[PDB]
Each structure stands twice: as structure tokens, then as C-alpha cells.
Design an enzyme around this catalytic site. Sequence first.
Site, PDB file in Angstrom:
ATOM      1  CG  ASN A   1      10.607   4.330  -2.653  1.00 29.95           C
ATOM      2  OD1 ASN A   1      10.882   5.239  -1.863  1.00 29.95           O
ATOM      3  ND2 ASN A   1       9.683   3.435  -2.401  1.00 29.95           N
TER       4      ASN A   1
ATOM      5  CG  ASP B   1       7.309  -0.480  -1.725  1.00 28.16           C
ATOM      6  OD1 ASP B   1       6.946  -1.676  -1.574  1.00 28.16           O
ATOM      7  OD2 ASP B   1       7.035   0.421  -0.893  1.00 28.16           O
TER       8      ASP B   1
ATOM      9  NE  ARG C   1       2.419  -0.981   0.103  1.00 25.40           N
ATOM     10  CZ  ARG C   1       3.745  -1.033  -0.016  1.00 25.40           C
ATOM     11  NH1 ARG C   1       4.382  -2.203  -0.120  1.00 25.40           N
ATOM     12  NH2 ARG C   1       4.441   0.101  -0.017  1.00 25.40           N
TER      13      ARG C   1
ATOM     14  CE1 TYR D   1      11.316   1.708   1.119  1.00 19.53           C
ATOM     15  CE2 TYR D   1      12.425   3.658   1.959  1.00 19.53           C
ATOM     16  CZ  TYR D   1      11.324   3.067   1.377  1.00 19.53           C
ATOM     17  OH  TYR D   1      10.233   3.841   1.050  1.00 19.53           O
TER      18      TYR D   1
ATOM     19  CG  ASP E   1       1.482   2.369  -0.018  1.00 16.13           C
ATOM     20  OD1 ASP E   1       0.728   1.434   0.299  1.00 16.13           O
ATOM     21  OD2 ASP E   1       2.721   2.330   0.150  1.00 16.13           O
TER      22      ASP E   1
HETATM   23  O1  LIG Z   1       7.121   8.195   0.755  1.00 18.08           O
HETATM   24  C1  LIG Z   1       6.452   7.084   1.327  1.00 18.08           C
HETATM   25  C2  LIG Z   1       6.417   7.337   2.819  1.00 18.08           C
HETATM   26  C3  LIG Z   1       6.378   6.081   3.671  1.00 18.08           C
HETATM   27  C4  LIG Z   1       7.389   5.024   3.305  1.00 18.08           C
HETATM   28  C5  LIG Z   1       8.132   5.422   2.057  1.00 18.08           C
HETATM   29  C6  LIG Z   1       7.196   5.813   0.945  1.00 18.08           C
HETATM   30  O2  LIG Z   1       6.304   4.724   0.729  1.00 18.08           O
END
Ligand SMILES: O[C@@H]1CCCC[C@H]1O
Lengths: 145, 144
Positions: free
Chosen positions: B51, B128, B95, B49, B97
Amino acid sequence: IEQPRWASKDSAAGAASTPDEKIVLEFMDALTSNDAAKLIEYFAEDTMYQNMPLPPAYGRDAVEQTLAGFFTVVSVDAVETFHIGSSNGLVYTERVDVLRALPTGKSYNFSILGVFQLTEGKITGWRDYFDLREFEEAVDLPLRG
Amino acid sequence: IEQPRWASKDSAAGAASTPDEKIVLEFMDALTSNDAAKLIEYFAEDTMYQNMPLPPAYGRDAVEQTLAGFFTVVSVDAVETFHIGSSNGLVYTERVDVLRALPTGKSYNFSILGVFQLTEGKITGWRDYFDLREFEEAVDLPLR
Ligand SMILES: O[C@@H]1CCCC[C@H]1O
Ligand SMILES: O[C@@H]1CCCC[C@H]1O
């Protein structure tokens, strides 16, 4: 630029197998031209280009003006596409672009995931997603966002 | 919220049409739980995972620890998936968030394109892609 650990062969660039997928890879190759005149030929009059989430460019004129402006201050030195794929009319490219700032000579690697929508073989949308923290400094132009 | 001009019906959420696509969407709904113990169940053991381009987490332990840490300082208030689609074993979510910093109550919209790789219905990779300019302010953890 090395292949990353997470690179999967089932979606690699060399295995493109729709026309839209192949045109996009061509377009990735042409990025190094630093030449908006050449690049604009890939777009339809009804099109858009956006580095997320900066203000998008709509219309072929805007896209061309935007690209032309970028190439005034930065060079696309390299583009490595790790994955190409497509679905429901959209094409995806996970990749790295190497950018060099003309006024400083500093280079920058940007990990990118881009989405392209094509209509009759021409780009009607292109949105790149990446971290813009270094993009401000890499591109000597105001971001507008 | 939103519904962008570039939103295609052909690739909308409600039109998810493979098991993997179905799963990523459910995983997307689950994010608003802020519960790392519940999320880690979507993940295979050999997994990662990231970022981009922050240091990735490899393995289920690291991933859970990373999510748990995030949910200590930030809430995922909304996830709005405009596009889902898949190709060559990968899934893609286009998307937004909405993240709310817990110490400040300040809210944040992140425009995101994520890639998912599932194996036997389990997440083996999740990356992501998005602008991290506000991430540092939004998430009260040091960036590596
Ligand atoms: O910081 C956010 C919280 C949830 C998942 C990781 C990121 O997208
Ligand atoms: O991706 C890059 C951003 C700046 C220069 C042109 C474009 O291809």
C-alpha cells in the site's frame, strides 16, 4: 530517484508504442513547466482532472484554474515515469512526482499511479492516485476534501 | 454504489477479456473473504505487496502475515471495480474498496488504482495507490 525493485522493462517509459501513450509521456515532461497556460493545450473542452478523491475539475476552464492555482504554491521539480501502458482507451502511468512548496522550500516525493483518457489526441480525463497525507502540507491551499 | 461519471463501458469489469484480467477480478471478489489463508493462494512465492508508500512486503510469508494482520482489525465489505485493463504484463484495477473497522463499526470508502503483475497466473506484484489519510483511523495498526 532510483528505479524501484518492482520495475518491469516490458512496460517502461522508453517503450511507449501507441500515439496516446506517447502524447501522455510528453505531457509528463511538460509538468515541470509549472505553466498552466502551456499544459492546458493538452486538454479537450470536454475533459476532467482529479487528484483522488478530492473534488474533480470538469471543463477546460476548471482544469486550467486548478492547475494555475497549484503552481502558485508548489513547483513540480521532477517527474519519473517507471511504467507506461494502455488498454481499452485508457493510458496508465506509474511514477513518482517531486513537489516543492514555494513558501517553505520543503520537498515531497509522491508515489503515483495515474490514468488518462484521450480522444482524438487530447486529454478527456486525468485522475491521479496517491497518498494525500503530505499533500495538505505540501500544497498551501484548502483541499476541499 | 457510485458508478462515476468518468466510467467507460469499454473498460468495464464485465468486459475483462484476458486470463490475467479474469484472475485479478476473481482475486478482487475474494478480498471480501477477509481470509488470508485463502488469499495467499493467488500469490507466487517470489512476490510483493504494498500500500504505497508504506513499507512493502516481499515474499509470500510477509504478504500473508501482512494480510492476516489487516483482517484482524478491518473488514473488506465491498470491492467495486469500475475499470479493468492490461498492458505489457501488468493489470490495472480502477476501483473502490469499502473497509469497516472492527473495533468501531465505522465504514470507509477508498478510491483506488491498483497495479498487478501475474506470472503463470500467480501474483508476483501488487501495488495499490490511494489516499491514506483515513487508512490510519480505519486500520487499528501502527503505520510504519
Ligand atoms: O486493509 C485492506 C484489507 C484487505 C487487503 C489489504 C487492504 O486493502
Ligand atoms: O501533480 C501536481 C500537484 C500540484 C501541482 C501541479 C500538479 O502537476
